[PDB]
Amino acid sequence: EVQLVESGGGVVQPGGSLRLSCAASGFTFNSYGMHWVRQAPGKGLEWVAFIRYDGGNKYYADSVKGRFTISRDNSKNTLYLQMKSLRAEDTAVYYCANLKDSRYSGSYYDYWGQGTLVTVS
C-alpha cells in the first residue's frame, strides 16, 4: 500500500542546481517526519537531511549544509530536496525515506523509495 516515488534526477554540470521531489501515498504523510539519504556508486549510505512533520524545523548533514534545502508540501504529499552548487562529489542515488526513529520522528515503521540518480559532470 505504502509507496515513495522519487523523481527529478538526471545529469547536471558542476556549480549548477537540481531539485528532487518524492511523491508519498498509502499513509498519513503529514504525520511523519521525512529523510533524504544518498548512496554514491561503490559507497555506503550517507544521511543528507531531515524535515519535521509540520515542515518547520530542518536538519542537514555537514557535507551538504549551506548548499541543500529540504522542504515539503503536505497538501500534495510531496517531499522536496533543493540542491544548489552541486559538485562532482554529490553524484549519488538519492532516496526519500521514512526512517524508524523512537527519538525524533516518532516513526514506528520503516519505508524507502526507489532512488533517483543525480550525476554532476
Binding site: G44, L45, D62, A97, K100
Partner: protein, 107 residues
C-alpha cells in the same frame, strides 16, 4: 557528530554458519541503533530497531544486542538469502549517521 564504524568490513560464510557483525560508536548512542540489510539494486531494509527489537516479518534466526558504544548483529544460521551488506545507523542525535557497512559473501 557521532562517528560509526563496523568490523569486519567483509566476511565470507556458508549455509548454517553463525555470522556476527560488530558496530561501534565514537559516543554513547544508548540503545539507539538500527540494523539494515541492503541487496544490490534495492533500498535498505530494516531488520532491527533500538539495538535488539526485531521488526515484524524478520526471521527468528536474526538477532542483536548491545549498549553504549558496542553493538553486535548476529545470524544464528546463515541462509543463501542472507547475502547482503549490513549497515548500522545511530539516531541518538542529529545528524544521523550510518556505518561503513559490512558485506557478507558466500563461502
Amino acid at each position: 557528530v557521532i562517528w560509526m564504524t563496523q568490523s569486519p568490513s567483509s566476511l565470507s560464510a556458508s549455509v548454517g554458519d553463525r555470522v556476527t557483525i560488530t558496530c561501534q560508536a565514537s559516543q554513547d548512542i544508548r540503545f539507539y541503533l538500527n540494523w539494515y540489510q541492503q541487496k544490490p539494486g534495492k533500498a535498505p531494509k530494516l531488520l532491527i530497531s533500538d539495538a535488539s527489537n526485531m521488526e515484524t516479518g524478520v526471521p527468528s534466526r536474526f538477532s542483536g544486542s548491545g549498549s553504549g558504544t558496542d553493538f553486535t548483529f548476529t545470524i544464528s544460521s546463515l541462509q543463501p538469502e542472507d547475502i547482503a551488506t549490513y549497515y548500522c545507523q545511530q539516531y541518538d542525535n542529529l545528524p544521523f549517521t550510518f556505518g561503513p557497512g559490512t558485506k557478507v559473501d558466500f563461502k
